[PDB]
Amino acid sequence: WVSKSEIKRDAEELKRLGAEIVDLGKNALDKIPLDADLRAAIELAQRIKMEGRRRQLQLIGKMLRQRDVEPIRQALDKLKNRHNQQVVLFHKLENLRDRLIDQGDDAIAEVLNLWPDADRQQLRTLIRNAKKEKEGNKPPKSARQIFQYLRELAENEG
RNA sequence: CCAUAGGUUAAUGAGGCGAACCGGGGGAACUGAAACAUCUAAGUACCCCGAGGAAAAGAAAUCAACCGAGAUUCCCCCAG
RNA sequence: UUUUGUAUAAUGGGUCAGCGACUUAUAUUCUGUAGCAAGGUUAACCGAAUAGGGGAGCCGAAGGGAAACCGAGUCUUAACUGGGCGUUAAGUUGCAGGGUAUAGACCCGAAACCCGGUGAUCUAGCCAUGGGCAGGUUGAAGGUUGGGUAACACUAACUGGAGGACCGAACCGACUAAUGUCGAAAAAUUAGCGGAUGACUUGUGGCUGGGGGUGAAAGGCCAAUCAAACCGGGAGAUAGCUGGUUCUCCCCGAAAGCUAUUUAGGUAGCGCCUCGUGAAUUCAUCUCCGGGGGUAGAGCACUGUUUCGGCAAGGGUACCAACCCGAUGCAAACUGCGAAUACCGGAGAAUGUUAUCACGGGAGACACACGGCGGGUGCUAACGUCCGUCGUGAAGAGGGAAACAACCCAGACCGCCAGCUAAGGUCCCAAAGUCAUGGUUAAGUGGGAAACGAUGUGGGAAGGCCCAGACAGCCAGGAUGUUGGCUUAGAAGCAGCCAUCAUUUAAAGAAAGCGUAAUAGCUCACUGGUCGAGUCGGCCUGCGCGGAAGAUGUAACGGGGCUAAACCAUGCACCGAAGCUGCGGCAGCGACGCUUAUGCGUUGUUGGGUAGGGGAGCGUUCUGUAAGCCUG
RNA sequence: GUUUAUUAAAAACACAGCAAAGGAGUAAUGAUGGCCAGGCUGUCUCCACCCGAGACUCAGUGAAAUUGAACUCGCUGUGAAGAUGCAGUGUACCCGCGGCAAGACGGAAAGACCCCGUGAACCUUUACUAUAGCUUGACACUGAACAUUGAGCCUUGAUGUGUAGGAUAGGUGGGAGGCUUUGAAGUGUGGACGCCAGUCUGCAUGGAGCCGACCUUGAAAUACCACCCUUUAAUGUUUGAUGUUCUAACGUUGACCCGUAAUCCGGGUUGCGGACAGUGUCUGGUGGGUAGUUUGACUGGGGCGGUCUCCUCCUAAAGAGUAACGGAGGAGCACGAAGGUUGGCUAAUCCUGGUCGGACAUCAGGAGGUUAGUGCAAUGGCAUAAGCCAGCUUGACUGCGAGCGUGACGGCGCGAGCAGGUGCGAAAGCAGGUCAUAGUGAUCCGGUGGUUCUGAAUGGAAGGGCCAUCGCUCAACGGAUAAAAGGUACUCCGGGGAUAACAGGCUGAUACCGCCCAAGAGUUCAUAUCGACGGCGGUGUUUGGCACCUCGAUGUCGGCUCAUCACAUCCUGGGGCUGAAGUAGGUCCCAAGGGUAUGGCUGUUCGCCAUUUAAAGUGGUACGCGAGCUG
RNA sequence: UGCCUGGCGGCCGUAGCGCGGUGGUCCCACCUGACCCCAUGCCGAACUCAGAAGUGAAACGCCGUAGCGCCGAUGGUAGUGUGGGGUCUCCCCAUGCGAGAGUAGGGAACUGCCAGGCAA
């Protein structure tokens, strides 16, 4: 016995995967192991829009009902993992910058712990300049300099 | 150094108010779709600028079709 | 008003007077009317102008197809014996009206969103200036004088006056109780109560302004309004929602059903309602005829289900048991059978204002309730819920059931101080039989209630014993071992193992009750005599009694009261409605004899009515008629 | 110390401490949580009296909520279901004054509770949609010198044998005269490619002659050239990524001077950075921080649970149709054959005999006429067989299709027959799918193939139109978006008793009580007292079933005050039986005149505990009584 | 015209089964061989081809037999439409229709066209 609710949920997951692969760019489609017919359907869906595009996506999901999805799911998982890693690194850099702007020496300690090679004097000078910019409504030159310095430190560490 | 900026004096003009109309710069929501996001409402509501008695536009780098009309503006058809 | 439903104790109204609700424009469809007619008609504009020009333009006469294109033909097809759309019917422009679509579009009512401005004299915080904190206490740091150390530490005496210190006034606050809730006060008064030198309080003047301000942080305060202030505009936002929709009369007159819905309290199509046109003895009741059922009933051939017995595969042969066989049952999901109704079609007399169908305009409604019948469900309980048919209410008053929509009789045109009748009634309330005949009842049954019980009473069929004398009564008998063996404690007939013998016999049992440790004793089955005629036990039942106790007051005939004024059978009379008939009066519908834009010498019938549809009218302001008429 | 101005002052909050311009086990403390002890008393048994203001009478002034109208009694039953107005019955002279409040479902607020609205408003997020902000890279402000290096256009030079061979020749080609002392053939030798087959040149002795089709070849000879692919190299060119230096852009809220009695600003010098930073467009990413929305319906109130489309049977009451969150089962296929024709054949279940083999394999005979089979759950039908086998085939075809069934409609199904061309069979004849009933998705949008149908001047083309076909568990399956989850007790708005919770009203499964039969218990004996197995009744004293009144407001558990009524009687009173010697009791009948507790635990009803009485009764009255009282 | 047979039908259990008797003059059946036509998922089994030697055994046709199967009244009863009544989870009254089962009884067929043989 198979529950209609489970079948509907599986269909929804298949349609979501189809929409994701359609959204993905040319390089992603090339990397993913998609057959010729599926690639043609994806290209047609990308070319078309509107209800026609959604029903082409539904056709893709119906085809995926029969065709295996494990390699496609693995490729999507790897791509999303890489993207999430990059996004998390960017978010952590932004958090470092924000805490440096707000607190000061407390964030300098964390920055030094994360990257011993970081220059404490330069970080303090940049933080003081950023505070002066905040007070005097000056452009975020110091904030962007701190962001670039953190990016360079992260790249050197990696 | 020159010179400029700045300063002093003389002459002309504006400074604000006024109901609506005109052009321009901004500019919504309610509501309809029996829901609602495109859309509509709407370039309407409302704010600002300027002149006038009207204003704006105005003499095609336009139409038309290879037949032909020769600025702009306004009214009725073409036309739901 | 809403409801299946309201006197409901569901909603609104204190009353009077005035004001208040389907209007307006633009296009479309239809109806009536008016001119023209295969033509009709003009917009803007001109116009000494409601005239006349202005044919720009719009509608139809020709449609088919997507189109090319064809043409009273055209699309499909390679094409039609074909099939889909047109031909044989006249449209147009106004006037008025019924709808349709947009404008706030029948009227009042939201919370809510955006735009532009006003608020920190209340209050939250902050900034600058000043003011206030009666009085009395605790009393550290520190300093001086001694004891005590190499120096320390520690300790006693004097000065000292720091504490978000203590008690307690002003001041701040509101923790408790009472009063005040249409109070003196839109958070107040009395006595207590905490702080009362600070993070305290306060006067004055400013700053922080609405998705914002402030907030020792409660979603608290921001001018008595704050989970997004106040004021003007979008804006008459929207409201599938609640309420209202105002003069009269005549005719007709439903539903709460099926399909679909982000769809259930709304909406779209159909059935149902109304108006008009056109159509066939069209439709309806019934007699007959040709029809198919699997329902009621019946049965178990089949499908299940159920009881007994046999052979019994197989399983563990005193033991479980398949498939089958014989008999007995049940089925909405069984029919070897099978109705009554109902439905279809045809023929036929009669009646019904065509009561039938097609089209067009307008609808309304799409919450149904109750009772009977056959059910599903629930508990064959529910004023419970869901089905199919009928009936009433909704939308129908009237008479009876005391009162009570859904029970019974019966469909109100109007008036009459006329008669008849249906249901129900005829002792009084209260109109009619204290009517007659033949029976039942002793119970207030009638006038609530079951399982069961009973010499209640009436009758039917019978049955047993009966003047060779029955049943019950009356002076009589009921003696002997059987103190029994047996479980010896005593059971002896009165506790049980046990037989359940035998003589006198007109006659009696080795034993039924009361009473003793058992005894004993008193009775009874049966047997003598008189009286003596009927007596005894069961079935069917009509009408009666118990089972039968509730709460404001008899309260389970309506009451009085009734022994017939209670129940069954029959009959004759009467009361009994808005039902029928009798008289007169009004209006619609169809006909014929005639009037022919209308009377009818007529004729038959109809006239309850909600939502709703059609038709006909009354009233008021203004305008022409109207410088006419009435009028000090 | 502060906190919800305006009833919540706390362990909560806060604190010292500890870890674009511009919170020091703890002394003390506490209107703090809990326990114990003493005093005190009107909190209470139980309340009595007195003092002042009202309340009462008189004189003067003088509102309010509410109001359909009232000539406005109780009881019984009915009724939209609790009657001042209905039917019956009893009672009551008319009209005032001081009180209580049981009611008039009494006044208050278009219920805050529950439901609905394809309602609103905030808050949350890995709901949808976006975006402020942040940010990546490219382009411009943005330059100059240098050190390399990836690559393109070329300029310039070699290099490149399947087999044929003087030859480590790839393609056409102006095709056939040039090279000549612009120091010749060949040479000591340096060097490049190198399948070791055979080309070559910076330089020179010498000194100025060598060569073209000529013989094979799918091409001929770098003799002159026009110009290139695999394979490589010197100069010049486009250049970018990266690195170093400089200033003239740009920054300077660094310093000095001036306008200037000037922390603004502008200008002049200088110092420090400097083509970095920043800004503007685009772009990748993040982004409940912000903003606009969504979160379906049936539902025995709502949520949860289950379902939303199609097929078979019943309910479905013998035409058709007919609902339930009613009772039983399936489906979103499959077959190029399991389809069409021609021909042929006919099982299940049993008995008999037979090696494995056995009850049940396969073989032969007997009964049997379908209980077999008919691909899929079931109905019906199927001997002509629609059931099974073999041969041939694609009619599972094309354009139609009269006439009907079926639904409101979209739509679905049947269908003789016309024309074309086919398959089977000699022929008559059959074939427009499957024995039939589930195996499916409207429209918009487009993809694919054909069609001059059209294609906005013409000739085309793009784009459309038509024919065929493809694309949705759009399963919420007549499918509102291509695109959406929750909380509100901070809530708000319009309504409902159309729909709940307390009560009211109907019924009585459940609950309590009474009774019929009587097995049996009771030392023998059913009925002194119980009494199983069974059955019949009364009450509305529990849980219940319905939702008929009430959501334009009926105050729902307790305690105090006040009580009233039924007896299914707790005591007192009158009796019967007894397994009643008497006191004391056990069971049942009549009897409601009277009475029928106090304290510790709870809010408690109830219940447990201790002590008394004759007892400390059961229930109805909106589970009595808040216009009477506390909460 | 009748005793017979075969084919094509109407009619379909009063029509079919169980038992006995009866037929080879014709027709029918059984039967012989299959080298050939034809066929066995193997077999002249079935079908097909050339004969009829032999026979009526089986089957087939006719008669009898009621032992079954089957048909089957009349009446009664159940049931039911209409209008009423009641001691109303059921029944009764007037009217109309009217079962099923069972019994008496019937029953072991009838009929249409043609062809062939016998006797007329």
Short mmCIF file of N, CA and C (backbone and C1' of nucleotides) in Angstrom, two decimals, chain D residues 46 68 104 132 184 196 225 232-233 258 290 329 378 425 435 441 448-449 459 499 581 622:
data_model
loop_
_atom_site.label_atom_id
_atom_site.label_comp_id
_atom_site.label_asym_id
_atom_site.label_seq_id
_atom_site.Cartn_x
_atom_site.Cartn_y
_atom_site.Cartn_z
P C D 46 -25.03 32.14 67.59
"O5'" C D 46 -25.11 33.46 68.48
"C5'" C D 46 -25.98 34.52 68.12
"C4'" C D 46 -25.24 35.84 68.04
"C3'" C D 46 -23.93 35.80 67.27
"O3'" C D 46 -23.73 37.03 66.58
"C1'" C D 46 -23.52 36.46 69.51
P G D 68 -40.08 49.57 24.44
"O5'" G D 68 -41.13 49.39 23.25
"C5'" G D 68 -41.43 50.47 22.38
"C4'" G D 68 -42.88 50.46 21.98
"C3'" G D 68 -43.89 50.58 23.11
"O3'" G D 68 -44.09 51.91 23.55
"C1'" G D 68 -44.54 48.82 21.66
P A D 104 -36.85 36.84 34.75
"O5'" A D 104 -37.98 37.84 34.24
"C5'" A D 104 -39.19 37.34 33.68
"C4'" A D 104 -40.28 38.39 33.68
"C3'" A D 104 -40.05 39.60 32.79
"O3'" A D 104 -40.32 39.35 31.42
"C1'" A D 104 -40.85 40.30 34.91
P A D 132 17.91 46.83 -3.17
"O5'" A D 132 17.65 47.54 -1.77
"C5'" A D 132 17.07 48.84 -1.70
"C4'" A D 132 17.11 49.37 -0.29
"C3'" A D 132 18.50 49.46 0.34
"O3'" A D 132 19.19 50.65 0.00
"C1'" A D 132 17.04 48.34 1.82
P A D 184 79.70 33.18 -55.14
"O5'" A D 184 79.23 32.21 -56.31
"C5'" A D 184 77.97 32.38 -56.94
"C4'" A D 184 77.71 31.31 -57.97
"C3'" A D 184 77.70 29.87 -57.46
"O3'" A D 184 76.47 29.51 -56.86
"C1'" A D 184 79.02 30.00 -59.42
P C D 196 64.84 4.98 -37.18
"O5'" C D 196 65.47 4.94 -38.65
"C5'" C D 196 65.39 6.07 -39.50
"C4'" C D 196 66.76 6.62 -39.83
"C3'" C D 196 67.69 5.67 -40.57
"O3'" C D 196 67.45 5.63 -41.97
"C1'" C D 196 68.85 6.67 -38.76
P C D 225 61.12 34.23 -55.39
"O5'" C D 225 59.71 33.49 -55.32
"C5'" C D 225 58.54 34.17 -54.88
"C4'" C D 225 57.46 34.15 -55.93
"C3'" C D 225 56.03 34.26 -55.42
"O3'" C D 225 55.64 35.59 -55.12
"C1'" C D 225 56.17 32.51 -56.99
P U D 232 55.57 21.37 -31.87
"O5'" U D 232 56.81 22.16 -32.48
"C5'" U D 232 57.24 23.39 -31.90
"C4'" U D 232 58.39 23.98 -32.68
"C3'" U D 232 58.69 25.45 -32.41
"O3'" U D 232 59.47 25.65 -31.24
"C1'" U D 232 58.63 25.08 -34.74
P A D 233 59.34 27.00 -30.39
"O5'" A D 233 60.36 28.00 -31.11
"C5'" A D 233 61.73 27.66 -31.26
"C4'" A D 233 62.39 28.50 -32.32
"C3'" A D 233 62.40 30.00 -32.07
"O3'" A D 233 63.44 30.41 -31.21
"C1'" A D 233 61.67 29.57 -34.28
P C D 258 47.26 85.46 7.96
"O5'" C D 258 46.50 85.60 6.57
"C5'" C D 258 46.93 86.53 5.59
"C4'" C D 258 46.08 86.46 4.35
"C3'" C D 258 44.60 86.77 4.54
"O3'" C D 258 44.33 88.16 4.57
"C1'" C D 258 44.84 84.81 3.23
P U D 290 11.96 43.87 10.77
"O5'" U D 290 11.70 44.63 9.39
"C5'" U D 290 11.92 46.03 9.29
"C4'" U D 290 11.75 46.52 7.87
"C3'" U D 290 10.43 46.17 7.20
"O3'" U D 290 9.37 47.02 7.58
"C1'" U D 290 12.21 45.68 5.73
P G D 329 -13.38 -6.04 2.42
"O5'" G D 329 -13.03 -6.23 0.88
"C5'" G D 329 -12.27 -5.26 0.17
"C4'" G D 329 -12.41 -5.45 -1.32
"C3'" G D 329 -11.26 -4.93 -2.17
"O3'" G D 329 -10.15 -5.81 -2.20
"C1'" G D 329 -13.32 -4.26 -3.12
P A D 378 -12.73 -10.99 -7.92
"O5'" A D 378 -14.24 -10.50 -8.09
"C5'" A D 378 -15.06 -10.23 -6.96
"C4'" A D 378 -16.19 -9.30 -7.32
"C3'" A D 378 -17.11 -9.79 -8.43
"O3'" A D 378 -18.15 -10.62 -7.93
"C1'" A D 378 -16.41 -7.57 -8.89
P G D 425 -6.49 -16.95 -46.02
"O5'" G D 425 -7.96 -17.44 -46.38
"C5'" G D 425 -8.58 -18.46 -45.63
"C4'" G D 425 -10.08 -18.48 -45.82
"C3'" G D 425 -10.57 -18.59 -47.26
"O3'" G D 425 -10.49 -19.90 -47.79
"C1'" G D 425 -11.77 -16.89 -46.17
P C D 435 -10.84 -9.90 -26.34
"O5'" C D 435 -12.29 -9.46 -25.86
"C5'" C D 435 -13.23 -10.42 -25.41
"C4'" C D 435 -14.61 -9.83 -25.28
"C3'" C D 435 -14.72 -8.55 -24.46
"O3'" C D 435 -14.40 -7.39 -25.21
"C1'" C D 435 -16.37 -10.08 -23.74
P G D 441 -7.71 12.13 -21.16
"O5'" G D 441 -8.30 13.51 -20.63
"C5'" G D 441 -8.29 13.82 -19.24
"C4'" G D 441 -8.19 15.31 -19.00
"C3'" G D 441 -6.98 15.99 -19.64
"O3'" G D 441 -7.32 17.32 -20.02
"C1'" G D 441 -6.87 16.24 -17.30
P U D 448 10.48 24.14 -32.80
"O5'" U D 448 10.06 22.67 -33.27
"C5'" U D 448 10.87 21.55 -32.96
"C4'" U D 448 10.23 20.26 -33.42
"C3'" U D 448 9.77 20.22 -34.86
"O3'" U D 448 10.82 19.99 -35.78
"C1'" U D 448 8.07 19.35 -33.47
P G D 449 10.84 20.77 -37.19
"O5'" G D 449 9.76 20.01 -38.07
"C5'" G D 449 10.10 18.79 -38.73
"C4'" G D 449 8.91 18.21 -39.46
"C3'" G D 449 8.24 19.10 -40.50
"O3'" G D 449 8.94 19.14 -41.73
"C1'" G D 449 6.59 18.07 -39.15
P G D 459 4.26 41.69 -53.42
"O5'" G D 459 5.77 41.20 -53.53
"C5'" G D 459 6.34 40.88 -54.79
"C4'" G D 459 7.69 40.22 -54.62
"C3'" G D 459 7.80 39.20 -53.51
"O3'" G D 459 7.28 37.93 -53.87
"C1'" G D 459 9.65 40.66 -53.41
P U D 499 -26.51 24.57 12.04
"O5'" U D 499 -25.21 24.71 12.94
"C5'" U D 499 -24.83 23.68 13.85
"C4'" U D 499 -23.99 24.22 14.99
"C3'" U D 499 -24.68 25.25 15.88
"O3'" U D 499 -24.21 25.13 17.22
"C1'" U D 499 -22.79 26.24 14.86
P A D 581 -34.21 -15.39 69.91
"O5'" A D 581 -35.00 -15.35 71.29
"C5'" A D 581 -36.29 -15.95 71.41
"C4'" A D 581 -36.79 -15.88 72.83
"C3'" A D 581 -36.74 -14.51 73.49
"O3'" A D 581 -37.83 -13.69 73.15
"C1'" A D 581 -35.81 -16.12 74.95
P A D 622 -34.77 26.93 39.55
"O5'" A D 622 -33.42 26.29 39.01
"C5'" A D 622 -33.42 25.44 37.86
"C4'" A D 622 -32.19 25.66 37.01
"C3'" A D 622 -30.96 26.17 37.75
"O3'" A D 622 -29.78 25.61 37.18
"C1'" A D 622 -31.55 27.72 36.07
#
